[PDB]
Amino acid sequence: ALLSFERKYRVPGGTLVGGNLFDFWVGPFYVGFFGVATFFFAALGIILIAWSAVLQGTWNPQLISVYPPALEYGLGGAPLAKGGLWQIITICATGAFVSWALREVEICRKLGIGYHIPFAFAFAILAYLTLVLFRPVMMGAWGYAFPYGIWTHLDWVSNTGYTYGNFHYNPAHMIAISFFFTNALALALHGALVLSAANPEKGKEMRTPDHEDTFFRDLVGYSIGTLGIHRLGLLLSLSAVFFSALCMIITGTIWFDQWVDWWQWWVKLPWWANIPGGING
Amino acid sequence: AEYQNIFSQVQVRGPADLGMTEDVNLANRSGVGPFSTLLGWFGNAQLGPIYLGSLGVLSLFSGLMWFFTIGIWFWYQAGWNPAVFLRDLFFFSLEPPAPEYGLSFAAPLKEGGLWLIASFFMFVAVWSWWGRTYLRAQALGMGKHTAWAFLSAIWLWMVLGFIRPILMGSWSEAVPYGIFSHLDWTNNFSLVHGNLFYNPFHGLSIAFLYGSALLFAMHGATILAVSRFGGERELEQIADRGTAAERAALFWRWTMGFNATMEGIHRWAIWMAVLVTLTGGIGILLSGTVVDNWYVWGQNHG
Amino acid sequence: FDLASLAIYSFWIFLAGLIYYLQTENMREGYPLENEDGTPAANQGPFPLPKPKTFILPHGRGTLTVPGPESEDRPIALARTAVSEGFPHAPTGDPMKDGVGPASWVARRDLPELDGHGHNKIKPMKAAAGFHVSAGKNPIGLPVRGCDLEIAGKVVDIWVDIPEQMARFLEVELKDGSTRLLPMQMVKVQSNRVHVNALSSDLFAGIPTIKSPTEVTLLEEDKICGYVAGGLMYAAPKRKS
Numbered sequence: 123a124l125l126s127f128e129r130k131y132r133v134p135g136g137t138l139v140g141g142n143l144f145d146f147w148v149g150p151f152y153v154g155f156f157g158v159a160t161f162f163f164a165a166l167g168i169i170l171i172a173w174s175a176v177l178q179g180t181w182n183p184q185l186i187s188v189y190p191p192a193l194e195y196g197l198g199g200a201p202l203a204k205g206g207l208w209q210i211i212t213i214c215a216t217g218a219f220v221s222w223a224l225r226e227v228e229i230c231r232k233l234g235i236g237y238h239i240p241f242a243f244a245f246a247i248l249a250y251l252t253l254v255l256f257r258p259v260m261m262g263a264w265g266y267a268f269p270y271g272i273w274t275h276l277d278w279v280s281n282t283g284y285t286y287g288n289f290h291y292n293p294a295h296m297i298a299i300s301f302f303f304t305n306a307l308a309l310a311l312h313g314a315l316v317l318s319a320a321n322p323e324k325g326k327e328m329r330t331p332d333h334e335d336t337f338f339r340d341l342v343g344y345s346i347g348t349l350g351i352h353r354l355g356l357l358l359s360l361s362a363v364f365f366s367a368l369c370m371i372i373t374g375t376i377w378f379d380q381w382v383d384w385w386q387w388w389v390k391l392p393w394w395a396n397i398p399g400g401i402n403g
Numbered sequence: 404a405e406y407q408n409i410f411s412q413v414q415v416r417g418p419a420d421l422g423m424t425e426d427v428n429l430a431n432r433s434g435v436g437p438f439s440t441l442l443g444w445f446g447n448a449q450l451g452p453i454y455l456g457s458l459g460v461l462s463l464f465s466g467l468m469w470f471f472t473i474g475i476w477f478w479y480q481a482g483w484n485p486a487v488f489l490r491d492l493f494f495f496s497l498e499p500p501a502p503e504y505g506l507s508f509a510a511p512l513k514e515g516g517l518w519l520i521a522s523f524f525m526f527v528a529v530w531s532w533w534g535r536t537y538l539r540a541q542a543l544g545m546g547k548h549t550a551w552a553f554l555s556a557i558w559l560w561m562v563l564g565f566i567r568p569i570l571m572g573s574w575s576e577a578v579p580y581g582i583f584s585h586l587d588w589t590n591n592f593s594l595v596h597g598n599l600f601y602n603p604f605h606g607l608s609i610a611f612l613y614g615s616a617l618l619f620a621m622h623g624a625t626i627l628a629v630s631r632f633g634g635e636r637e638l639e640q641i642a643d644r645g646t647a648a649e650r651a652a653l654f655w656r657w658t659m660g661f662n663a664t665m666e667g668i669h670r671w672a673i674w675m676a677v678l679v680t681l682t683g684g685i686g687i688l689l690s691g692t693v694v695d696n697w698y699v700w701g702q703n704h705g
Numbered sequence: 706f707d708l709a710s711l712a713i714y715s716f717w718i719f720l721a722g723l724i725y726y727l728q729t730e731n732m733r734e735g736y737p738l739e740n741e742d743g744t745p746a747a748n749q750g751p752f753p754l755p756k757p758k759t760f761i762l763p764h765g766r767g768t769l770t771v772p773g774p775e776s777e778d779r780p781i782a783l784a785r786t787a788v789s790e791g792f793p794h795a796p797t798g799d800p801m802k803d804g805v806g807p808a809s810w811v812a813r814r815d816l817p818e819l820d821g822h823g824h825n826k827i828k829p830m831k832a833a834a835g836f837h838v839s840a841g842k843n844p845i846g847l848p849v850r851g852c853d854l855e856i857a858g859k860v861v862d863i864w865v866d867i868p869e870q871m872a873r874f875l876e877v878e879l880k881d882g883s884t885r886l887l888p889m890q891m892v893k894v895q896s897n898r899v900h901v902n903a904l905s906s907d908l909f910a911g912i913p914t915i916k917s918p919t920e921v922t923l924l925e926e927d928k929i930c931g932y933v934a935g936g937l938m939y940a941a942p943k944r945k946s
């Protein structure tokens with residue numbers, strides 16, 4: 123159950139709640155108070171999805187789908203059969219994600235490392251909550267949230283997007299995609315670079331970080347360095363998700379028309395608005 | 404509070420670093436550029452030197468010809484005036500030839516011919532850049548991981564504008580050069596093929612794209628968390644595991660039940676990313692050549 | 706079948722071997738698994754250890770073969786707190802002095818990391834020609850304050866990563882005239898002092914010392930960094946808000 127080097131780190135302490143009550147492992151897994159909390163919320167959510175599926179009349183995971191309450195309920199409670207289950211499940215999921223984060227904080231404290239991981243995780247948690255809590259509440263109904271099902275949730279993405287024309291035209295959505303794409307570029311390169319140095323041409327000595335910096339300066343004229351690239355990845359990642367949340371928080375709230383039409387602000391600026399020719403005159 | 408290590412608190416600067424030599428032809432390295440303080444808060448301050456061989460100058464010459472070929476077309480569409488040019492920047496497009504001309508190179512400048520010229524220039528710009536990626540690594544005796552990862556990205560690009568157009572028998576099927584026009588194309592591609600959300604390859608692509616954000620978020624956060632034990636010094640931690648590597652593994656083992664090594668995580672990294680364009684390119688390649696409608700395909704699977 | 710379902714079914718197979726390969730590659734340190742008493746555990750999981758690979762280290766420093774024989778190569782001052790697997794192991798001495806818990810260090814080589822030219826990666830700036838503070842507050846000359854809000858010392862130099870051009874340690878002079886290294890990542894350069902949250906003024910002398918004054922070894926770095934990180938848990942009683 124332990125890695126060869128692990129015993130020295132398995133000391134008491136670091137818990138936020140409960141003292142030494144839950145300060146133990148199960149196999150490789152740290153538990154803690156929040157270990158117990160996440161189990162409780164996950165078990166309860168799964169039971170409730172199971173129940174949803176009996177009411178639906180299918181056990182096929184490609185068809186199971188827990189829907190939010192219809193718009194007619196607004197921000198009220200709804201009957202279990204018609205949206206209440208989705209509401210309770212959402213509470214449980216939120217409880218399980220937040221508990222998972224706090225458990226990582228316990229683990230950080232015991233290992234004496236920084237808190238960057240759970241902090242980053244909170245960005246994902248915040249994107250989730252944008253879609254199922256913040257946007258719906260500003261829009262005035264739980265019905266604007268996405269349903270829990272494999273294919274139904276894509277249906278939602280597609281119907282939601284096409285409500286506003288071609289969603290490509292949401293300008294925050296453009297920024298977000300840029301970061302997503304750039305993050306994947308950066309991850310390919312980082313992985314490639316380190317491995318290209320640890321694993322040089324056959325017969326040669328392992329390369330050094332200097333070879334890494336040289337390689338990039340030769341290639342593109344700059345190298346951000348080894349601390350810089352981990353800072354970069356963290357930032358590209360989190361920015362991606364930040365701009366994702368933002369492109370949705372503004373959709374249906376401050377802006378509810380077709381996104382393509384938003385760009386008329388630019389083209390109708392008075393300096394060029396009526397100058398003939400081009401595409402727009 | 405405690406320091407987070409997102410920005411440096413102090414910058415330190417020494418003599419410019421001319422780099423490792425190994426088998427590089429030093430006659431083709433530039434001078435060093437200036438030092439950026441701005442950049443130095445986040446990573447290195449040093450700009451330069453850069454390497455310019457035959458393959459670099461070729462890439463860069465063609466790349467510029469591609470860009471200017473497009474811009475000539477845009478300036479033209481803008482009746483040659485700079486207000487209209489800025490006003491409609493996003494709406495101008497260089498479209499490929501009409502289906503009528505199929506794969507012929509006989510289409511006129513104003514109706515396809517320019518698209519081809521530009522595409523030709525882009526083709527050599529990229530492939531030459533690819534070779535330079537390989538040769539720069541060889542000159543320093545490193546692995547070819549970067550050239551191979553870059554190839555994955557070239558795969559999708561090549562499928563989009565070259566292979567799939569050849570396999571469908573017309574250039575009209577390729578992507579136009581424009582900001583809004585290439586978004587329209589993308590949305591249109593999906594509609595025409597019965598909704599790309601039923602393309603299983605498209606869905607895997609998504610998973611690796613999201614997965615790449617997940618992993619780089621995990622990996623960077625981890626390395627910053629153990630940078631107080633010199634975690635960023637990844638090659639020496641490979642050669643000689645330290646407490647940084649140990650705690651990084653253990654955080655994750657205790658969290659989710661398993662873990663990586665300092666070398667191993669980078670294999671996870673390179674593959675997660677590479678598989679985005681790898682699966683994507685297959686998804687697009689099969690669209691219209693073999694499957695007309697992914698909904699329909701999804702109903703049978705055959 | 707059709708060609709697309711041929712493609713997708715192939716892909717899933719491919720992907721399974723890929724995970725297999727990836728997972729076994731990530732088993733080159735730390736395995737086999739052990740019981741808490743250090744003997745080899747019964748259940749190692751479904752993936753086998755990979756065939757060994759050998760790194761050729763640069764600058765005459767030999768080879769590394771992994772996987773290879775694992776061994777802490779140091780005493781661990783811990784004892785069990787329960788009669789069954791899975792519970793914490795209490796330090797039997799002073800965990801900061803003994804190097805356990807968040808204060809752990811690994812017995813890395815007792816040589817300094819070298820750069821691509823064979824020179825020591827990290828150097829005091831006094832011995833690193835051409836190097837200067839280009840931006841931010843220069844810490845040199847600042848008093849150093851511990852989490853008990855008492856002065857432990859003064860900064861007398863910055864130790865720099867020459868190839869990466871980066872500050873890595875502050876060298877701090879203590880009341881008796883000796884110095885210690887503190888990692889940059891654990892300090893806070895304010896305008897009129899350096900603040901160190903992990904340690905109280907009384908634990909600064911306990912920081913492990915280096916055997917030569919113009920270099921640090923990888924073993925010494927691990928001991929130093931382990932120690933000051935450890936104070937986050939173990940110095941806590943003396944840390945004011």
Ligand code: BCL
Nearest residue numbers: 246247249250279280282283289290298299363366367370
């Ligand atoms: C046809 C539809 C429209 C469209 C409509 C929409 C809509 C509608 C939305 C997006 C959103 C996004 N779109 Mg868009 N989009 C379109 C075309 C595109 C294209 C493209 C190539 O054309 C791209 C690249 C994108 C890209 C994106 C991303 C920027 C963003 C999704 C990532 C995200 O938010 O993650 C955020 C991540 C999460 C929410 C994951 C949270 C994970 C949680 C915290 C934990 C999970 C735990 C779980 C239970 C695990 C259990 C594990 C097991 C037990 C092991 N879109 C088309 C034009 N797009 C979405 C967005 O911005 O959302 C905020 C969004 O809602």
Ligand code: BCL
Nearest residue numbers: 556557559560589590592593605608609612683684686687
């Ligand atoms: C309405 C539109 C359709 C749709 C239509 C398409 C189409 C069509 C495609 C995708 C593709 C993708 N879509 Mg989809 N997509 C939709 C909905 C989504 C949603 C969502 C709803 O949330 C998401 C998250 C995605 C996500 C994705 C990605 C996984 C994938 C692109 C990978 C990539 O990195 O490409 C970006 C990377 C490249 C294009 C490679 C570029 C490499 C070259 C070599 C770069 C050269 C640079 C050049 C020389 C310029 C130099 C610059 C200067 C030097 C600075 N789609 C909807 C349903 N999507 C692509 C795919 O793979 O499909 C399977 C694709 O073709």
Ligand SMILES: CC[C@H]1c2cc3[nH]c4c(c3C)C(=O)[C@H](C(=O)OC)c4c3nc(cc4[nH]c(cc(n2)[C@@H]1C)c(C(C)=O)c4C)[C@@H](C)[C@@H]3CCC(=O)OC/C=C(\C)CCC[C@H](C)CCC[C@H](C)CCCC(C)C
Nearest residue numbers: 164167215218219222242243245246271272613616617620
């Ligand atoms: C911040 C940017 C990116 C990011 C980062 C990130 N994610 C992380 C972390 C970080 C730093 C972790 O530390 C943490 C982790 O442990 O990773 C291994 C995590 C994590 N990211 C995860 C998933 C995930 N992240 C995603 C996204 C991202 N994560 C971003 C792109 C996505 C996407 C893109 O969709 C997914 C699916 C988990 C693997 C893990 C957190 C695990 C967790 O919270 O476990 C506790 C919860 C359970 C065990 C299950 C509870 C079940 C529910 C109660 C019921 C199910 C409800 C759900 C709404 C059903 C939905 C059905 C779908 C079909 C729609």
Ligand SMILES: CC[C@H]1c2cc3[nH]c4c(c3C)C(=O)[C@H](C(=O)OC)c4c3nc(cc4[nH]c(cc(n2)[C@@H]1C)c(C(C)=O)c4C)[C@@H](C)[C@@H]3CCC(=O)OC/C=C(\C)CCC[C@H](C)CCC[C@H](C)CCCC(C)C
Nearest residue numbers: 303306307310466467470528529532552553556676677680
């Ligand atoms: C795993 C897939 C991901 C990926 C990977 C990837 N991309 C890569 C690589 C890899 C592994 C490289 O090695 C390669 C690289 O060199 O990166 C630094 C590259 C690269 N990815 C690039 C872009 C790119 N990658 C993308 C995507 C992705 N790449 C995926 C997300 C995208 C997207 C998301 O669409 C883009 C836009 C390029 C930066 C670079 C390849 C460069 C290239 O082929 O260039 C040829 C053309 C030119 C050199 C000239 C271009 C002309 C410009 C319009 C102006 C440029 C400046 C000007 C010329 C300088 C000043 C002129 C004079 C005053 C001197």
Ligand SMILES: COC(C)(C)CCC/C(C)=C/C=C/C(C)=C/C=C/C(C)=C/C=C\C=C(C)\C=C\C=C(/C)CC/C=C(\C)CCC=C(C)C
Nearest residue numbers: 470473474522523526560561563564565578580581582585
């Ligand atoms: C300020 O004004 C100036 C004049 C100075 C310049 C301004 C220039 C300017 C603003 C230009 C704008 C450029 C833009 C926005 C370009 C947009 C490009 C986009 C969005 C491209 C997207 C996708 C392209 C693809 C997928 C193309 C792939 C091409 C391939 C695969 C090559 C195919 C090759 C051929 C068809 C050649 C065939 C012949 C042979 C021999 C192979």
Ligand SMILES: CCCCCCCCCCCC[N+](C)(C)[O-]
Nearest residue numbers: 171183184186187188270271272
């Ligand atoms: C062809 C088999 C597909 C298996 C997919 C994985 C099944 C896990 C359970 C899915 C739960 C579906 N749910 C509740 C999100 O709707």
Ligand SMILES: CCCCCCCCCCCC[N+](C)(C)[O-]
Nearest residue numbers: 341342343432433434453455463
């Ligand atoms: C992604 C493409 C990277 C392009 C980098 C462009 C740098 C231009 C080179 C200018 C150098 C000219 N020189 C050598 C005379 O100094």
Ligand SMILES: CCCCCCCCCCCC[N+](C)(C)[O-]
Nearest residue numbers: 343344433434435436450451453
């Ligand atoms: C994407 C990276 C940004 C491009 C940086 C290019 C740096 C080139 C520096 C070389 C300039 C040489 N010169 C003319 C000053 O002597």
Ligand SMILES: CCCCCCCCCCCC[N+](C)(C)[O-]
Nearest residue numbers: 603604606607610614671674675
């Ligand atoms: C190297 C990383 C491996 C992680 C792979 C994650 C698998 C995602 C499964 C997505 C389901 C795709 N599908 C069947 C709907 O097309």
Ligand SMILES: CCCCCCCCCCCC[N+](C)(C)[O-]
Nearest residue numbers: 123149150659660661749750751
């Ligand atoms: C999405 C696939 C399922 C989640 C990933 C599996 C987690 C594996 C960790 C449990 C196994 C660890 N082990 C063998 C020590 O018990």
Ligand SMILES: CCCCCCCCCCCC[N+](C)(C)[O-]
Nearest residue numbers: 660661662724728749750751752
């Ligand atoms: C779904 C993402 C990838 C899943 C990979 C699952 C790998 C599990 C490895 C468990 C090995 C744990 N163990 C027993 C060796 O310690």
Ligand SMILES: [Fe+3]
Nearest residue numbers: 312316626637
């Ligand atoms: Fe890394």
